[PDB]
Amino acid sequence: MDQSNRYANLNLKESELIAGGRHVLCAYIMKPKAGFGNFIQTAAHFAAESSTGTNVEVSTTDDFTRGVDALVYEVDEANSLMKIAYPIELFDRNVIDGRAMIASFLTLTIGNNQGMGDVEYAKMYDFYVPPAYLKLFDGPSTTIKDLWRVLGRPVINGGFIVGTIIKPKLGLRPQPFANACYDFWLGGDFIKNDEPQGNQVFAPFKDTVRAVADAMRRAQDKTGEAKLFSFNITADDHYEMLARGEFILETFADNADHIAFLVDGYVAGPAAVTTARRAFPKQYLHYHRAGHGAVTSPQSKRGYTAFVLSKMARLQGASGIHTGTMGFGKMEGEAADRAIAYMITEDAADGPYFHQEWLGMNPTTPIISGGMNALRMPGFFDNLGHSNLIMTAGGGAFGHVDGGAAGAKSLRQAEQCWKQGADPVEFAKDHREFARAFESFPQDADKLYPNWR
Amino acid sequence: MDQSNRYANLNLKESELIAGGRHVLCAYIMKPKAGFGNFIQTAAHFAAESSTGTNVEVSTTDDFTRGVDALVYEVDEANSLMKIAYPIELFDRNVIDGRAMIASFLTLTIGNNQGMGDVEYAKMYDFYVPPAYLKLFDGPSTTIKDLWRVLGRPVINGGFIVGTIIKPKLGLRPQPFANACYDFWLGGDFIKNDEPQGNQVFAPFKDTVRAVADAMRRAQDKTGEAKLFSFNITADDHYEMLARGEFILETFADNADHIAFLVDGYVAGPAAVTTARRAFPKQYLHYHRAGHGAVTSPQSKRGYTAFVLSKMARLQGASGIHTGTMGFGKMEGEAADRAIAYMITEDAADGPYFHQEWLGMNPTTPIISGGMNALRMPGFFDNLGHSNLIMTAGGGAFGHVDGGAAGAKSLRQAEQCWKQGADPVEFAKDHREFARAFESFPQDADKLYPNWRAKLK
Amino acid sequence: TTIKDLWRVLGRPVINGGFIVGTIIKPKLGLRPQPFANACYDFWLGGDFIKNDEPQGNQVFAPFKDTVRAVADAMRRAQDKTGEAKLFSFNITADDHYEMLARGEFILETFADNADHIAFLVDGYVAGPAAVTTARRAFPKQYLHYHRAGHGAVTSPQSK
Ligand SMILES: O=C(O)[C@@](O)(COP(=O)(O)O)[C@H](O)[C@H](O)COP(=O)(O)O
Ligand SMILES: O=C(O)[C@@](O)(COP(=O)(O)O)[C@H](O)[C@H](O)COP(=O)(O)O
Ligand SMILES: [Mg+2]
Ligand SMILES: [Mg+2]
Ligand SMILES: [Mg+2]
């Protein structure tokens, strides 16, 4: 049967649904499966499976039920575009405090509709959230401002945070791990656990934390500068996340405001992210997205995009989220991905389909990571347009020919070169650690700065 | 750089890595992106990004680190097959109790590797978990056996639990919702919240729970039989899940062993599933997988299959998990998906690539749902082979021409027919509610039982 | 939890896995942490399972936390030497519910990757059902060992 008379109204105007402030709007690229309905019928069925219906009429439906139906308001068969309007009354709210949950938004807008037999694929590209719904989300409580304050930087346009990931990914016992943190910190600001580091049997959590705290104190005393760490506290069990966070804050003591908490939020879920957001609102929430590629990749025609994810992460409370290297590194990415960063940092931004007012909600930091080194940084900043961010480089730092300290210094210098408007090879005559990144990575050097020899 | 001399050892034997007990094994269908390295180099890099390395040599690597490298032990370029062995030392364990977390397994075996630029796609199809690692997982604490006990059925081969989903998906205010529960229960056993039902402003949670409890009491009084309900307690906030679960158990009181807790585990994540598994181990954990299709669909070449998801759900502690209609309903599915059910219910089972011994870990119930009705049920059981399960049918029940109660009876009758093995259409001659399911869904009827109109009048 | 969980940890078949060879540590009381730990090591070279004698806990000459720590060290020296899994049953009995919790939590965390080798013992007749239920509901995944010291006052055939 077909349900477009009830779940489609193409005579509605997007400008009026927005000005009315009663509807979440979602934009999808969808294709029906050969053998069922035409585009409108398939789209109307989609809206029903995502709102108030199923595949047949049921005797229990009443007039109040119809009032909250999600409607298909705009379609473009030749570009595969479908747009749906969801009344805000559909979304779940906490009993304890009346706030919104991201899990409800996902369950409706991108849940069972992803397994419909009469649809070949559908992927969400953009969404709009009006004021009355927007205000019920947590938003971030800690920002890069709080990291700038701890480093001694100005709290407005404090600049580039030079960082690394401890490599190898797994395998370092507590003291070697701690020794490699010391070395980087002699030249850099910030260090994160690689996403799987935690409580492996060859590197127990408590011994590793304790050896890193010792290394932070020794690095601060030697250099006279503040240092930062991002610990992974990801777990299935909510009380294991708490236990880990509490041990860290207590162990670091007077360096407790130098600590960020990392959460693998795509594989652990919103629940893990909200555990850390609500239990530790004063510690920088670092959101790591490992596994996201299964859906976000342009090779995928299902799910949602990295843009959508990032937009959601901000509403959830992430202090920073990995946004990718925008084609500049080792992972899949595009230069057009610069728009992702601007949606998460500004108070008004444009998406592929929707303009979004954030109403003063705190910004989320773009965390640039993924096969970056000193040589690839200039090109990257040129495309994005600023350096008010954290950038982590593991192989780029520990793979430097002269070690982790020098690797750290080459990343600083590379941003000073860009900031100044200087030519890389020429700049590399006054700055040795940067010059040696050319011999560290001669394959990259030959590509970007050909005749450097 | 070529890393195949470190992360590849094709001279290892699957049979010995299994016997040896020290490795998790994963099987993937992988294709390298053009103009990079070959199959083995791509595969070796994959293993490095999924264990100890990165795309570049680092001066901090030591011989201890190598001992724990994940290795590529089997490749078949023609079939796109890649197999990797992960030392169990690599996986994270809780400080509080020394147990395993599924989140660690995922982060390594299907994480950063899903965004690698030199790989076009990779999807996990099967995994093996040895004893030393399998025994560190929660497993389910509550099974169908506990729902059979409550209904009064035998606790071994207790049979088919007749169920529904409350429809409209959303829109019913507390009393009309409660009235629709009452009606179904006059003919059926079990009712679930549709996956988004919770605390919407037009249907507050506490008023809905209270009206449902009253309707359970009045249904049990009128019919003399035990009734069940599965409440959605999904939330971002751990303490909101607890608050919801505690209010339900306390409200239902002497009917609180009739209550299951439903969790949208795919979109909310493992952490939400574990919250419910650890806080309420004596209430049946109902795992709902809304959103899974983004990766599990055969149209996807990335992520992992429904098979893998289901296998994971059991290790996490799901009492039951939606396994799909296996091609007989409205969602994407296949007949070959019967193997999924057999992996989650038995103590030893075969996957597409590995054999798994569960070592006595509790089974997970297959929950069959998705555009089912009385007419589609016979075909479905014939393919699966048994009816020791829960099946929910929303439109199938409430869209029956004579109502929710008659809709419920038609689902019962359809399993009774398959059980004794009658001709469906002849069975319908002497079974009213089942016969009227033909007129309720005449499109389906004409397709499955072609000449039915003649016999049935 | 059942014996089948203890068979799984030892490597035995989970159905008819057989006879678990065990001891109590004697002296009933009097062993200081290391000597107590040394006696655990020695038995484990030939046996599977060890329990606290029913009054062992936090006596002033053998503090609880030093004893647990020394037993953990002896478990992994025993597993290293023999190549086989070992088990221990710790008494966590107390009047105060939160003292039971505090003791159980310290043990699981100390033993770490050997935490599934731990059973919790409760003197359920003298402390009562409430103590048994505390341990049943707080730690459902750890083997609940019920000790009945004092039961004879009523169960005896001398008693009518
Ligand atoms: O795990 C890694 O390999 C990284 O630490 C980079 O290390 P290297 O510097 O040695 O490459 C990051 O987690 C990935 O970039 C994550 O990807 P994304 O940012 O796209 O989520
Ligand atoms: O919302 C729905 O559509 C359902 O309640 C079915 O309703 P109907 O029975 O009325 O069609 C189920 O959530 C899906 O079937 C889940 O699918 P899966 O088992 O594939 O996860
Ligand atoms: Mg990483
Ligand atoms: Mg549903
Ligand atoms: Mg004794």
Side-chain angles (χ1 to χ4, degrees):
Chain A
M1 65 165 70
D2 347 294
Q3 301 174 98
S4 40
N5 289 314
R6 189 190 162 188
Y7 294 94
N9 184 14
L10 293 177
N11 300 300
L12 298 173
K13 300 172 201 156
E14 172 176 292
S15 71
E16 297 200 320
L17 290 159
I18 293 182
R22 304 303 302 160
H23 290 89
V24 169
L25 307 175
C26 290
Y28 313 81
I29 297 266
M30 185 274 278
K31 171 170 190 310
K33 225 202 206 79
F36 300 86
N38 53 33
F39 207 86
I40 190 61
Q41 288 179 333
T42 302
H45 185 201
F46 194 104
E49 292 291 343
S50 291
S51 78
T52 53
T54 185
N55 61 166
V56 291
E57 280 273 309
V58 300
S59 55
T60 44
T61 281
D62 61 359
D63 291 333
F64 186 97
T65 286
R66 298 185 160 86
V68 303
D69 292 344
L71 298 182
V72 177
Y73 74 87
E74 208 187 304
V75 287
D76 183 5
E77 208 166 338
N79 289 296
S80 303
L81 186 75
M82 159 182 65
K83 295 194 194 182
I84 305 188
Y86 297 83
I88 60 180
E89 305 84 334
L90 295 180
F91 301 102
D92 207 358
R93 323 285 181 90
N94 299 333
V95 171
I96 64 175
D97 64 17
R99 302 322 206 275
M101 53 185 101
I102 206 55
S104 182
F105 164 77
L106 288 164
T107 295
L108 284 150
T109 71
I110 211 82
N112 278 344
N113 67 58
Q114 298 301 291
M116 297 164 63
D118 59 333
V119 167
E120 179 175 345
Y121 56 75
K123 188 171 197 172
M124 198 193 298
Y125 273 74
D126 203 352
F127 66 94
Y128 174 75
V129 40
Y133 193 46
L134 177 49
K135 77 195 212 332
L136 302 176
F137 283 90
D138 273 352
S141 55
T142 294
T143 70
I144 190 178
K145 285 183 71 170
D146 311 301
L147 298 183
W148 284 327
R149 194 182 297 107
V150 167
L151 290 167
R153 307 285 191 81
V155 300
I156 298 205
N157 298 311
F160 180 68
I161 292 177
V162 173
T164 199
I165 305 110
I166 309 293
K167 262 51 167 83
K169 174 159 306 211
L170 289 153
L172 290 176
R173 287 150 283 176
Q175 202 50 55
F177 186 99
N179 296 321
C181 291
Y182 178 69
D183 288 335
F184 180 72
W185 274 331
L186 289 150
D189 305 320
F190 174 109
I191 301 185
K192 64 187 287 300
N193 276 144
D194 212 328
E195 74 278 337
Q197 287 156 11
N199 193 38
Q200 284 81 22
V201 298
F202 55 80
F205 171 77
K206 282 191 184 184
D207 295 336
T208 296
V209 175
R210 286 192 209 105
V212 178
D214 175 67
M216 181 179 289
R217 278 178 269 103
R218 299 179 306 102
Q220 299 188 151
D221 292 316
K222 166 64 85 199
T223 73
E225 270 164 281
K227 307 296 162 183
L228 309 175
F229 214 98
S230 199
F231 283 106
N232 167 45
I233 68 162
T234 307
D236 291 14
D237 189 2
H238 165 92
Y239 302 98
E240 166 73 14
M241 291 192 60
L242 303 192
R244 284 191 184 184
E246 292 163 6
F247 181 76
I248 291 158
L249 296 188
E250 169 174 341
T251 301
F252 278 71
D254 61 325
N255 293 319
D257 67 334
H258 300 210
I259 294 293
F261 291 144
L262 179 150
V263 171
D264 296 326
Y266 179 80
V267 290
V273 178
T274 298
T275 285
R277 174 53 182 76
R278 291 184 169 203
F280 310 101
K282 262 224 174 318
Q283 307 291 147
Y284 192 98
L285 211 181
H286 183 157
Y287 183 139
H288 198 278
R289 58 177 197 173
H292 76 97
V295 293
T296 62
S297 173
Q299 198 279 332
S300 160
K301 299 295 108 223
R302 332 181 57 81
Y304 51 72
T305 59
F307 177 84
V308 168
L309 163 65
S310 304
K311 196 164 176 192
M312 284 183 311
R314 180 169 185 186
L315 295 164
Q316 293 178 81
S319 304
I321 186 160
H322 280 246
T323 51
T325 62
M326 313 191 183
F328 295 96
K330 85 190 173 180
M331 299 297 202
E332 300 186 330
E334 282 179 354
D337 294 349
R338 77 173 83 81
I340 297 180
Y342 288 89
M343 177 60 68
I344 67 174
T345 61
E346 312 296 299
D347 190 58
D350 276 318
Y353 294 92
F354 312 119
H355 176 87
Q356 188 64 75
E357 289 292 335
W358 290 92
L359 304 179
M361 181 169 283
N362 273 329
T364 300
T365 315
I367 307 167
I368 310 309
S369 164
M372 290 295 288
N373 57 53
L375 311 176
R376 296 166 170 255
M377 284 174 46
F380 174 81
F381 296 127
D382 264 5
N383 171 74
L384 169 63
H386 77 83
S387 66
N388 283 350
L389 44 72
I390 306 161
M391 187 186 287
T392 29
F398 295 105
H400 196 287
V401 71
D402 302 328
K409 293 170 186 178
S410 81
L411 309 158
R412 179 90 61 194
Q413 292 171 12
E415 191 268 357
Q416 288 167 358
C417 185
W418 169 77
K419 202 53 177 280
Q420 293 169 23
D423 176 62
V425 180
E426 281 182 352
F427 177 97
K429 295 164 190 173
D430 285 15
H431 308 88
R432 175 161 174 76
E433 299 86 345
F434 186 87
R436 298 283 292 184
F438 277 91
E439 301 183 67
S440 292
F441 321 95
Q443 304 83 34
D444 287 359
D446 293 334
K447 287 168 195 151
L448 289 184
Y449 317 113
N451 306 318
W452 68 275
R453 290 289 195 338
Chain B
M1 58 167 56
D2 192 354
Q3 305 183 69
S4 60
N5 277 17
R6 186 180 164 195
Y7 294 98
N9 198 342
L10 299 182
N11 286 318
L12 291 168
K13 309 179 183 160
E14 182 184 299
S15 66
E16 298 195 335
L17 296 161
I18 285 166
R22 308 271 78 210
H23 292 91
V24 166
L25 306 176
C26 293
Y28 312 81
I29 288 305
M30 181 274 282
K31 187 188 195 293
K33 218 185 229 75
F36 292 94
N38 64 31
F39 201 75
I40 201 55
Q41 298 169 292
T42 306
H45 187 202
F46 193 103
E49 298 285 347
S50 309
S51 80
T52 56
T54 182
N55 76 155
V56 82
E57 224 186 358
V58 293
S59 48
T60 54
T61 270
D62 52 19
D63 311 306
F64 188 87
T65 311
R66 296 169 181 275
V68 298
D69 291 345
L71 297 181
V72 179
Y73 71 94
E74 208 186 303
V75 292
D76 196 335
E77 196 166 17
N79 299 295
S80 298
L81 186 70
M82 175 190 54
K83 294 183 195 182
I84 306 191
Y86 296 84
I88 58 162
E89 288 74 35
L90 296 177
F91 302 102
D92 210 355
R93 323 285 180 91
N94 299 333
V95 171
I96 64 176
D97 65 17
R99 302 322 205 275
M101 53 184 98
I102 206 59
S104 183
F105 165 76
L106 289 165
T107 292
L108 284 147
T109 67
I110 206 82
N112 286 359
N113 69 45
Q114 290 294 280
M116 287 163 82
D118 57 341
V119 167
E120 179 175 343
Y121 56 75
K123 188 171 197 175
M124 197 193 301
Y125 274 73
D126 200 356
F127 65 96
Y128 174 74
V129 43
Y133 193 46
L134 163 67
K135 75 196 215 296
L136 300 173
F137 283 91
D138 272 358
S141 48
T142 288
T143 78
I144 194 163
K145 168 198 299 288
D146 310 308
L147 297 184
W148 284 327
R149 193 183 297 107
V150 169
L151 289 167
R153 308 284 193 79
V155 314
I156 304 200
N157 302 346
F160 180 69
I161 291 176
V162 173
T164 196
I165 312 117
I166 296 284
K167 301 299 192 186
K169 174 153 293 220
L170 289 163
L172 287 177
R173 289 152 301 179
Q175 201 58 34
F177 189 96
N179 291 339
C181 293
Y182 178 83
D183 266 22
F184 182 71
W185 276 325
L186 300 186
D189 303 323
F190 174 108
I191 301 186
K192 64 187 286 300
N193 274 143
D194 213 326
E195 74 277 337
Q197 287 155 18
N199 194 39
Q200 284 79 19
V201 298
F202 55 82
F205 171 79
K206 282 189 182 185
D207 297 339
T208 298
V209 174
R210 287 191 208 105
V212 179
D214 182 62
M216 176 169 298
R217 210 177 307 120
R218 293 175 295 95
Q220 287 169 168
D221 290 7
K222 224 207 104 185
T223 74
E225 314 282 9
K227 307 297 162 183
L228 310 172
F229 200 103
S230 198
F231 284 98
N232 169 41
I233 68 164
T234 309
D236 293 9
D237 187 4
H238 169 77
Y239 302 97
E240 167 73 18
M241 300 195 42
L242 302 190
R244 284 191 184 182
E246 292 163 5
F247 181 76
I248 292 156
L249 295 191
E250 168 173 341
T251 299
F252 278 70
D254 61 321
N255 292 316
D257 65 329
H258 316 209
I259 295 293
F261 291 144
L262 177 151
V263 173
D264 298 327
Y266 184 80
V267 290
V273 182
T274 298
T275 284
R277 174 54 182 77
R278 290 184 169 200
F280 310 99
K282 261 209 153 277
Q283 307 290 147
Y284 184 106
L285 211 183
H286 185 158
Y287 183 139
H288 199 276
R289 58 178 197 173
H292 77 99
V295 292
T296 62
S297 174
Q299 194 279 311
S300 167
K301 298 263 195 307
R302 326 173 61 73
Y304 53 71
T305 61
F307 168 86
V308 170
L309 178 65
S310 303
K311 194 166 178 192
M312 285 185 311
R314 180 172 184 184
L315 293 168
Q316 294 175 79
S319 290
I321 187 163
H322 281 245
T323 51
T325 59
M326 311 193 183
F328 297 87
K330 87 189 173 179
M331 302 281 170
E332 284 186 300
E334 290 191 336
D337 295 354
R338 63 189 298 277
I340 297 181
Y342 291 110
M343 179 60 68
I344 66 176
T345 59
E346 312 295 296
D347 191 55
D350 276 318
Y353 293 93
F354 315 107
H355 176 87
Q356 188 66 74
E357 298 290 330
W358 289 93
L359 303 180
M361 180 171 282
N362 272 325
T364 300
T365 315
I367 305 168
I368 310 309
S369 169
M372 293 296 287
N373 59 50
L375 311 177
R376 296 166 170 254
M377 285 155 87
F380 175 86
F381 295 122
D382 264 312
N383 183 57
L384 179 42
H386 76 67
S387 38
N388 298 326
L389 49 87
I390 305 176
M391 182 192 278
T392 26
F398 292 104
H400 190 281
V401 55
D402 291 304
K409 294 169 178 186
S410 57
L411 307 174
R412 181 88 69 189
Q413 290 166 19
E415 191 270 344
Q416 291 170 352
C417 172
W418 174 77
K419 212 78 227 205
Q420 55 193 301
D423 183 29
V425 201
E426 301 208 46
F427 179 88
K429 299 182 190 178
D430 322 305
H431 298 86
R432 219 321 169 81
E433 297 65 20
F434 185 71
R436 297 274 282 162
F438 288 71
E439 306 177 50
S440 298
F441 316 103
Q443 303 169 38
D444 290 330
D446 297 335
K447 211 240 269 83
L448 301 161
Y449 320 117
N451 303 298
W452 74 268
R453 281 235 173 45
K455 14 176 150 229
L456 241 147
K457 269 211 74 193
Chain C
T1 296
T2 73
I3 194 185
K4 158 196 254 282
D5 301 311
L6 296 174
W7 283 326
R8 194 182 298 108
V9 169
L10 288 167
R12 314 246 210 113
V14 299
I15 288 180
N16 295 321
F19 172 66
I20 293 176
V21 174
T23 198
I24 316 122
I25 306 296
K26 305 291 186 187
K28 164 163 290 181
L29 289 168
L31 292 186
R32 293 154 293 175
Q34 209 66 82
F36 182 106
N38 301 330
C40 285
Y41 178 74
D42 276 291
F43 183 81
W44 274 324
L45 290 178
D48 305 321
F49 174 110
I50 303 185
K51 64 186 287 300
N52 273 144
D53 211 325
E54 74 275 337
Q56 287 155 14
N58 190 34
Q59 285 77 21
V60 299
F61 55 80
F64 172 78
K65 269 173 193 192
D66 297 339
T67 296
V68 177
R69 285 192 209 104
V71 178
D73 188 64
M75 177 168 294
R76 83 197 112 84
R77 293 189 292 96
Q79 289 172 175
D80 280 63
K81 183 63 184 300
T82 66
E84 281 98 16
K86 308 296 163 180
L87 309 172
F88 199 104
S89 197
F90 283 100
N91 169 42
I92 67 165
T93 307
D95 291 13
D96 188 0
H97 168 80
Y98 301 98
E99 166 72 21
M100 293 188 67
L101 304 189
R103 285 189 184 186
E105 293 162 8
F106 180 76
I107 291 156
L108 296 192
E109 169 173 344
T110 304
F111 278 71
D113 62 322
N114 292 315
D116 66 333
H117 301 209
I118 293 291
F120 290 144
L121 180 145
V122 170
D123 297 328
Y125 179 80
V126 289
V132 182
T133 300
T134 284
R136 173 55 182 77
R137 291 186 167 199
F139 309 99
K141 247 168 178 357
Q142 306 289 148
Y143 192 99
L144 209 171
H145 182 155
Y146 184 139
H147 199 277
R148 58 176 197 174
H151 76 99
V154 290
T155 62
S156 191
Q158 205 276 314
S159 169
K160 296 216 175 64

